Design a binder for this molecule. Structure first.
Ligand SMILES: CCCCCCCCCCCCCCCCCC(=O)OC[C@H](COP(=O)(O)O)OC(=O)CCCCCCCCCCCCCCCCC
Ligand SMILES: CCCCCCCCCCCCCCCCCC(=O)OC[C@H](COP(=O)(O)O)OC(=O)CCCCCCCCCCCCCCCCC
Ligand SMILES: CCCCCCCC[C@H](CCCCCCC(=O)O)C(CCCCCC)CCCCCCCCC(=O)O
Ligand SMILES: CCCCC[C@@H](CCCCCCCCCC(=O)O)[C@@H](CCC)CCCCCCCCCCCC(=O)O
Ligand SMILES: CCCCCCCCCCCCCCCC(=O)O
Ligand SMILES: CCCCCCCCCCCCCCCC(=O)O
Ligand SMILES: CCCCCCCCCCCCCCCC(=O)O
Ligand SMILES: CCCCCCCCCCCCCCCC(=O)O
Ligand SMILES: CCCCCCCCCCCCCCCC(=O)O
Ligand SMILES: CCCCCCCCCCCCCCCC(=O)O
Ligand SMILES: CCCCCCCCCCCCCCCC(=O)O
Ligand SMILES: CCCCCCCCCCCCCCCC(=O)O
Ligand SMILES: CCCCCCCCCCCCCCCC(=O)O
Ligand SMILES: CCCCCCCCCCCCCCCC(=O)O
Ligand SMILES: CCCCCCCCCCCCCCCC(=O)O
Ligand SMILES: CCCCCCCCCCCCCCCC(=O)O
Ligand SMILES: [Ca+2]
Ligand SMILES: [Ca+2]
Ligand SMILES: [Ca+2]
Ligand SMILES: [Ca+2]
Ligand SMILES: [Ca+2]
Ligand SMILES: [Ca+2]
Lengths: 639, 639
């Protein structure tokens, strides 16, 4: 029935097309699994045991990574007044009973995942791999740190759990390779940036020693390097230069010129470079993906010929199309695609195919023809009861007006909830959960499970959906109604006036899970530093606190006293909304100026990753939507 | 001796090459001046009288445009307590004696400039031109508004003086054509932006009616459209949602998600479109410049042939090269540049050149060969005294080691001023002005005046230089020293690690006088509205003032009470440094909510002009520096 498990046959024609399939969605086979003379050994039976059991790991990888808000402050134990939540968080900290029990679950599924591939690698290959060397070394640190915390330094567990989580998921590991290639270009331009403040912190220190400014703010030199740095951010534009503006108006024409050159040229010209190297790293990554295509299709070509003369005949290629489980038609499609595929010299009558010549053909059936779909029938015991009865169900759903009725009836679904909100006031709340699950139970069986996972954001829907079922067993549904109308703006994207915008903006939701995943990881590093470095300062009873800007502006909850409060407090520093409130606080709270180098180290690293990974990527991928909108209507007219 | 004035001869070969010169720097000749059968009539004698006398107009155009800070508040006359400078400016307002005297100068040189091209256009052409029609109509309003002031409404003079000044200078007029072509794309995407606030102002109004938030901030719906708009700017990130964060921590996950989608996607996806249409408007402007090349070189081709059979012979083309007066020796360089120019007809062997074929040749001598230089000798009475003696001078300066000694001895020039600063404490200040003018008096005589004007930013230097001489006749020299070391960072751009950055940043100083000129003009519109609309509100003795954020944050010097205080207040609103202090003030000072639509109109219009004309242009022009750096080393190796 299916095409999933078949690595045990894997004939001349059987799994050879699935090798050609792995160019299409580009799944990975390890090069050693491609290296073998059989290339389908007992090792590879274990390899496909991973990619079926993969989503077990995201109930580890996210599970390990989100442990860190649930953990304690570093220092409640020296403290007095412990259990007072003076500005702390709301999640309960897991005590040493609940500490260790969560971690035996965690270090199990690591060791299964990390010592998985020796099932399909040689030990001299596993233990040689520099990527693998780090992840095993990151295991043992946790494997130590679990065992030490049982019997019971600054506790470097939670720095590692990020770096396991970065290296584990292939998006975040692919992403981070760029910031080895970008970083050699970014750091050289940073020396030219760092020069721009220093040159222009020097003049305004020199210029305003004489006036009221050096009496007030610009006392030290490094108290101008501090201040004219904050003007480069412009979260401080009038408050810096009031007493230079108040005395003579002609000091604005300095500061309105420095900020102007600072923001509107340089922070574009940092963006210009970081957008320029991102172009060159993206292709160098992409051509690093197509050698994985060519080193797959070489295996797809080398599996065919036994003589390995370098050539496959047309019927020898048509028998691939017959073993393709093909679309519906094969009389002359290769004969149709002879000249249509870019170049054939057509020397011999049919049987002139080179190793390069095939690599266009499997991509052409992927791009234009879109031939294949995996049924994935059943497990074999209830199958025939349901395989007959599915033809009385899945006749209904595969009818596309009913598929439009999946869009049409989804309009009805949110309409009842508005009036029912008031009238439930004038459990009953769990009753409407049954209506929500019902529509999504249908198309799972129509599609198939990973066929449901291949769908765009309906993938993301069932991610939301089951937790809604889980969250009701342990009001909010009112605010959770909005996800239904959220996909009705996916009917806005067919509007031609507003197309290439929402063509981007919906495509850019899966396109920025890596590059916004990494930024979430960088915060989980910077928070865990702020927990350890800046932990217990903002007290109830601190008297150096209340004269600082966190008290006047009342941002006391934006605080590093725990982990999750520091997790939000990084976010405003990431946004640049009044981010100097914290920087001028902790220069007074820790009391010395080495705390300043925390937040600048945030800025230099964030305004790579913002100017790179968010901002510069959209201006690429909008152009991918744009020309594929234009060259759909161009080659809708052209050929 | 000279090559300037020669439109009175203009032989078959004489001014014909100067037609080919007018493709090189691309100066403009009007199409009617190209239309004529003579094309060098008595009209065109007056046309070159303009472009020599052009810099007389910038002592009008800047003169007219900078008049507006020197003028009065709209309303001191109803007021009590006039001559108290309660938060006012510092420039003296020109009284009605000095008001009119400045304007007879001004309306003279307009009328000379505006009724100039009747000297070279027909009356049915001058008065048909709608680009001319507006400027004449803008004259008469000022011609009225001067005469009304002499014989003693809201005084719409100063709106016009900008719009004369925009249409007068060809940079600002070329720029503004784009924002007719961009605006049809920008406004359609704005309706999708405007939708994003409204959709998401609606939820947080709905979501937080129940909690503390709707008690505090989110009372009205339109008081969330107000606030969630300011979160789109993020000049207000924690202060908006404290009491939604203070009560339940889980309401940050709204706001940290809304801002995230708001800033990092949409304000890139406004930038992506506005950078995309700027690409398409720039080329459409540029191909609008090359038809001006082709409709010049058609005149350059049509002036040659008397039979107009369509062909020019090789010697008939070589006699251009002899008349060109730009190379050393020319026996077979046409024969060198035959096949080197992309395609030759070569039919009737040396003599078959099409109208298209020449257009590469005139561009090739400008680009690659580049042997033109205009001598511009003297006026004819002191000429031979100096022209003989210049060969005893300009033997020195055109020697390239002395040209490096213009770079080398300029390094010495700033060094003495640091120690001399302290020792002048222990007029003498005007003595060091003589050293500064001296070095720039040299190369002018070596180059020539407009030859000095063709230079990159040394052009800008003499603009600085003479006002220094003027400003000393009517301390600051210390801060004026810095312009010498300012050009030593032009010896940093030859460093290969930092080249393509400063290749941009120095080329982008002339490249953003238009697109930062327009933004300067938009403020002079918005200030003049703020003078008239928001003029006299911020009193000394206002009692609704001191409880507002302009008093607490103490930005009281940033009113638009006068003109130039509102010129600078618009700067901070352009930067986005605490710009909601003003918006929440003037909603209390004028007291009703129509003042809000002032500052949003400043946002929507400027965050086109920032995201367009500043930001998106740099990411183009950095790529122009980048590939011309690469394809200098590529075709330094290739051909
Ligand atoms: C707080 C909870 C966060 C929830 C976010 C859920 C994201 C769902 C991802 C689940 C899939 C795990 C696969 C990731 C890597 C393994 C292989 C692979 O390449 O799959 C690619 C996967 C699709 O490929 P396939 O499913 O393997 O076929 O693409 C993705 O969508 C996920 C890529 C990165 C996911 C982790 C990074 C982001 C997580 C943290 C987010 C924090 C805040 C972000 C705010 C942005 C708001 C817009
Ligand atoms: C406050 C005083 C501002 C001083 C700025 C000086 C501006 C230089 C003007 C040069 C002479 C006037 C020519 C412009 C009219 C078009 C004719 C032409 O082709 O010349 C183009 C000229 C070069 O071409 P050429 O000299 O004719 O060969 O290019 C330019 O450099 C000037 C182009 C626009 C000038 C007016 C717009 C800007 C003025 C307002 C500045 C305020 C904001 C600037 C802040 C940014 C800081 C980095
Ligand atoms: C590079 C851009 C990355 C975006 C920055 C991180 C976003 C901040 C989110 C975490 C902090 C809020 C947690 C509040 C905890 C508390 O104070 O109780 C955060 C990420 C959410 C996932 C998608 C957003 C980007 C975590 C949200 C969890 C909320 C927990 C609140 C507890 C509720 C209770 O009362 O128990
Ligand atoms: C879109 C961004 C445009 C950038 C240009 C901005 C100004 C740069 C320098 C121009 C200076 C003009 C001086 C004219 C003299 C006068 O009218 O006062 C600039 C645009 C803001 C974005 C605005 C800032 C200019 C403010 C000038 C104030 C000087 C007042 C001095 C009076 C007191 C005295 O001289 O004694
Ligand atoms: C581009 C650099 C040029 C100007 C460089 C400025 C470096 C000056 C360093 C001085 C540091 C502090 C000076 C006075 C304060 C003190 O005595 O410590
Ligand atoms: C990247 C440029 C600056 C980065 C962070 C700003 C550093 C400015 C210097 C800090 C304060 C100056 C030294 C204090 C003087 C003192 O000890 O009295
Ligand atoms: C990689 C490091 C980045 C650069 C860090 C900036 C180092 C300069 C620190 C400035 C301190 C100068 C203040 C001394 C003057 C004084 O205290 O009187
Ligand atoms: C993923 C890499 C980890 C990043 C580097 C972490 C170590 C840098 C500084 C750590 C602590 C610095 C301050 C310690 C002072 C203290 O504990 O009181
Ligand atoms: C990675 C770039 C970070 C840049 C910021 C560096 C922090 C420098 C701190 C400057 C403080 C001045 C030195 C005196 C220290 C002290 O007085 O305690
Ligand atoms: C991607 C990881 C980046 C890591 C850089 C962050 C570490 C720089 C500063 C951390 C805290 C140092 C300042 C603490 C001052 C103190 O000891 O009191
Ligand atoms: C995308 C739009 C969907 C939601 C649109 C929300 C429009 C609601 C309009 C209500 C305005 C004020 C409502 C209560 C205040 C009043 O009674 O005036
Ligand atoms: C572009 C989106 C918004 C633009 C400016 C914000 C408009 C907010 C609405 C004004 C405040 C509330 C309206 C009146 C309420 C009242 O009169 O009580
Ligand atoms: C081109 C115009 C842009 C759109 C301008 C905003 C239009 C909506 C104004 C919001 C007012 C709604 C407030 C009414 C609710 C109330 O006062 O109770
Ligand atoms: C260059 C175009 C000019 C811009 C438009 C100018 C007129 C728009 C509004 C002008 C005044 C606004 C209302 C005046 C109220 C008052 O005078 O009290
Ligand atoms: C050009 C776009 C500007 C958008 C801002 C529009 C200003 C709308 C003002 C909203 C105020 C609510 C209406 C009530 C007026 C009043 O009470 O005086
Ligand atoms: C490029 C020119 C843009 C012109 C747009 C600015 C005019 C919009 C609002 C001007 C002031 C209107 C608000 C004043 C309300 C009042 O009279 O109190
Ligand atoms: Ca073979
Ligand atoms: Ca054939
Ligand atoms: Ca900001
Ligand atoms: Ca001829
Ligand atoms: Ca020839
Ligand atoms: Ca304050």
């Amino acid at each position: 029935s299916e095409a999933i498990t078949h690595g045990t046959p894997f004939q001349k024609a059987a799994a050879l097309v699935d090798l050609a399939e792995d160019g299409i969605g580009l799944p990975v086979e390890i090069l050693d699994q491609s290296s073998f003379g059989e290339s389908a050994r007992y090792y590879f039976i274990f390899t496909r045991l991973d990619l079926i059991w993969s989503l077990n790991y995201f109930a580890l990888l996210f599970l390990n990574f989100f442990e860190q808000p649930l953990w304690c402050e570093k220092n409640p134990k020296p403290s007095c007044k412990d259990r007072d939540y003076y500005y702390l968080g709301e999640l309960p900290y897991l005590t040493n009973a609940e500490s260790i029990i969560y971690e035996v679950i965690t270090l199990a599924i690591l060791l299964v995942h990390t010592f998985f591939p020796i099932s399909y690698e040689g030990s001299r290959i596993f233990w040689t791999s520099r990527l693998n060397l780090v992840k095993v070394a990151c295991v043992v640190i946790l494997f130590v740190d679990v065992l030490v915390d049982f019997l019971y330094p600054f506790r470097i567990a939670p720095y590692v759990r990020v770096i396991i989580f970065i290296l584990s998921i292939r998006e975040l590991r692919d992403t981070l390779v760029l910031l080895s290639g970008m970083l050699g270009t970014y750091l050289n331009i940073l020396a030219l940036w760092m020069l721009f403040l220093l040159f222009a912190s020097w003049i305004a220190f020199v210029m305003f020693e004489n006036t009221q400014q050096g009496l007030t703010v610009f006392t030290s030199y490094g108290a101008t390097l501090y201040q004219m740095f904050i003007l480069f951010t412009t979260s401080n534009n009038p408050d810096v230069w009031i007493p230079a503006y108040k005395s003579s108006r002609w000091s604005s024409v300095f500061f309105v010129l420095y900020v102007l050159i600072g923001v509107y040229f340089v922070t574009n010209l940092i963006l210009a470079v970081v957008y320029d190297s991102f172009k060159e790293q993206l292709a160098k990554q992409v051509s690093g993906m197509d050698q994985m295509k060519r080193r797959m299709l070489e295996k797809a070509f080398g599996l065919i010929d036994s003589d390995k003369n370098g050539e496959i005949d047309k019927n020898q290629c048509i028998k691939l199309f017959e073993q393709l489980t093909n679309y519906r038609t094969l009389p002359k499609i290769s004969k149709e695609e002879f000249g249509l595929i870019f170049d054939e010299l057509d020397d011999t009558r049919d049987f002139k195919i080179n190793k390069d010549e095939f690599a266009d053909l499997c991509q052409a059936i992927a791009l234009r023809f879109q031939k294949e779909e995996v049924p994935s029938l059943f497990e074999h015991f209830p199958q025939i009861y349901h395989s007959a009865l599915s033809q009385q169900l899945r006749a209904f759903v595969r009818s596309p007006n009913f598929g439009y009725a999946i869009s049409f009836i989804l309009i009805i679904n949110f309409i009842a909830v508005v009036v029912e909100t008031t009238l439930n006031i004038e459990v009953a709340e769990f009753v409407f959960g049954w209506i929500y699950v019902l529509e999504m139970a249908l198309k799972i069986y129509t599609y198939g499970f990973e066929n449901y996972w291949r769908e765009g954001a309906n993938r993301f829907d069932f991610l939301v959906t089951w937790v809604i079922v889980i969250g009701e067993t342990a009001q909010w549904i009112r605010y959770l109604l909005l996800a239904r109308m959220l996909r009705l703006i996916r009917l806005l994207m067919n509007v031609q006036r507003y197309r290439a915008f929402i063509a981007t903006f919906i495509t850019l939701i899966p396109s920025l899970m890596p590059y916004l995943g990494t930024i979430f990881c960088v915060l989980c590093i910077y928070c865990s530093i702020g927990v350890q470095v800046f932990g217990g300062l903002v007290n109830a009873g601190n008297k150096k606190l209340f004269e600082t800007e966190l008290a006047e502006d009342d941002y006391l909850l934006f605080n590093f006293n725990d982990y999750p409060n520091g997790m939000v407090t990084l976010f405003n520093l990431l946004v640049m909304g009044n981010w100097q409130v914290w920087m001028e606080s902790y220069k007074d709270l820790t009391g010395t100026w080495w705390s300043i180098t925390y937040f600048v180290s945030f800025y230099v690293i964030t305004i790579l990753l913002l100017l790179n990974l968010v901002v510069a990527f959209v201006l690429e991928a909008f152009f991918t939507e744009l020309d594929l909108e234009e060259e759909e209507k161009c080659q809708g007219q052209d050929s």
